[PDB]
Design a binder for this molecule. Structure first.
Ligand SMILES: *CCC(=O)N1CCc2ncsc2C1
Length: 338
C-alpha cells in the first residue's frame, strides 16, 4: 500500500500519485489520480469513537441520496470486502481546487463573485431543505470551489431531518455546530431543528464575503450572542414576547440597550441589494427570517434566479450499539464493491 506522511493511505491500484492536501473534520485528505475516469479526485480517510462514527454514516446516507450540482457527491468508497477485515473507509469525491475559507483568507471578492457564490449556496440549500434536511454546519470551509468558481456544499456530518415541533429547549443548551455561524436562538431556546438555522449561517457567510472577516467571531458560547446583539441591537418587545422561556427572556431583558449598527456602516463598499438581503437573512426572530426560496427570488440575485433551474429532491429524506453502526456503514457502502 501507498504511505503518506508516516501513515497508511491504502486506496488500491485504482488510485495512485497521491499528494497530501491536509486534515479535514475526518482525518487525512489526499488527491490521487483515478486511473478509470482519468482525472484527479479527492480521497478522505475515515478510521474507527461513536460520534465520529455516527456522523460518517449520516454523511454517507445523505450524500448518496442527494444528486445536485451544488452539493458534493460520493464517487466511490473503498473498504475491505468483509466486516471482519473492515478498518479504514476511503471516500472518493470530485477534486475541488479550494474552498471559501481558504479563498477569503487571501482574496478580495468582486461583487460579481459574491453574487454568484451566494446564488449557488442558496441553490444547493433549496435542494437540501426540499429534502426536509438541515445542514446545520454551513461555514466557508464547507463550501468547495473549483478553478471556475463552481461551488459545492460539503460535510453533512451534523445534518438532521427538520423537526420544528421539537425545536424548543432551555436557555444555554449546549450545541455542536461551529460557533461563529450559530443563530441567536441556539443560545436562547432552539435545538437547531428548523430551516431558519441554515439561513442564519448563510447570512453570516454573506457578511464574511463582503469584508473577508467573520461578522460575529464569538470566543465562547454566550459571547456569540453578545456579538450578534452588538450589531443587530436589542430585540424588540414583540421579538422578546416570542421567547416564552423565562431564563432566556430575562437574560435579554437584563442587558443594556444596544443600538443597531447600520449595515452600510459595517459594509460601506457593499451593493445595496446585497445588504437588503443580508438584513433579511440576519433577522433576530427566526419566524421573521427569510426562507431559501425567498432569498433566491430577492432582487440581488435577479441575474441568476430561475426556479425551473433550481431543482428539488424527489422525496423527503428518511433517517445505536457500536457493532450495529459498523454493520450499517458496511451495508451503506456495499454498492461500490465488486
Ligand atoms: C467538506 C470537504 C469535502 O467534502 N471535500 C471533498 C472534495 C475536496 N477536494 C479537495 S479537498 C476536498 C474535501
Amino acid at each position: 500500500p501507498e504511505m503518506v506522511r508516516g501513515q497508511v493511505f491504502d486506496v488500491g491500484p485504482r488510485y495512485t500519485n497521491l499528494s497530501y492536501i491536509g486534515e479535514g473534520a475526518y482525518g487525512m485528505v489526499c488527491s490521487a489520480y483515478d486511473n478509470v475516469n482519468k482525472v484527479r479526485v479527492a480521497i478522505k480517510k475515515i478510521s474507527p469513537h461513536q460520534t465520529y462514527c455516527q456522523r460518517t454514516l449520516r454523511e454517507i446516507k445523505i450524500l448518496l441520496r442527494f444528486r445536485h450540482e451544488n452539493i458534493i457527491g460520493i464517487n466511490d468508497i473503498i473498504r475491505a470486502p468483509t466486516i471482519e477485515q473492515m478498518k479504514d473507509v476511503y471516500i472518493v469525491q470530485d477534486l475541488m481546487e479550494t474552498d471559501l475559507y481558504k479563498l477569503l483568507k487571501t482574496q478580495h471578492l468582486s461583487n460579481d463573485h459574491i453574487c454568484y457564490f451566494l446564488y449557488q449556496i442558496l441553490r444547493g440549500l433549496k435542494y437540501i431543505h426540499s429534502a426536509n434536511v438541515l445542514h446545520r454546519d454551513l461555514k466557508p470551509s464547507n463550501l468547495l470551489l473549483n478553478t471556475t468558481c463552481d461551488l459545492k456544499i460539503c460535510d453533512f456530518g451534523l445534518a438532521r431531518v427538520a423537526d420544528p415541533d421539537h425545536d424548543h429547549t432551555g436557555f444555554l443548551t449546549e450545541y455542536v455546530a461551529t460557533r461563529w455561524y450559530r443563530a441567536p436562538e441556539i443560545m436562547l431556546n432552539s435545538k437547531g431543528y428548523t430551516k431558519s438555522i441554515d439561513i442564519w449561517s448563510v447570512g453570516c457567510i454573506l457578511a464574511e464575503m463582503l469584508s473577508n472577516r467573520p461578522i460575529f467571531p464569538g470566543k465562547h458560547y454566550l459571547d456569540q450572542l453578545n456579538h450578534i446583539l452588538g450589531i443587530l441591537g436589542s430585540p424588540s418587545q414583540e421579538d422578546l414576547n416570542c421567547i416564552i422561556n423565562l431564563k432566556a427572556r430575562n437574560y435579554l431583558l437584563s442587558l443594556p440597550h444596544k443600538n443597531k449598527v447600520p449595515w452600510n456602516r459595517l459594509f460601506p463598499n457593499a451593493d445595496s441589494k446585497a445588504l437588503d438581503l443580508l438584513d433579511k437573512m440576519l433577522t433576530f426572530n427566526p419566524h421573521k427570517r427569510i426562507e431559501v426560496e425567498q432569498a433566491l427570488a430577492h432582487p440581488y440575485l435577479e441575474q441568476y434566479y430561475d426556479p425551473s433551474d433550481e431543482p428539488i429532491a424527489e422525496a423527503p429524506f428518511k433517517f445505536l450499539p457500536k457493532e450495529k453502526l459498523k454493520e450499517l456503514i458496511f451495508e451503506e457502502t456495499a454498492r461500490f464493491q465488486p
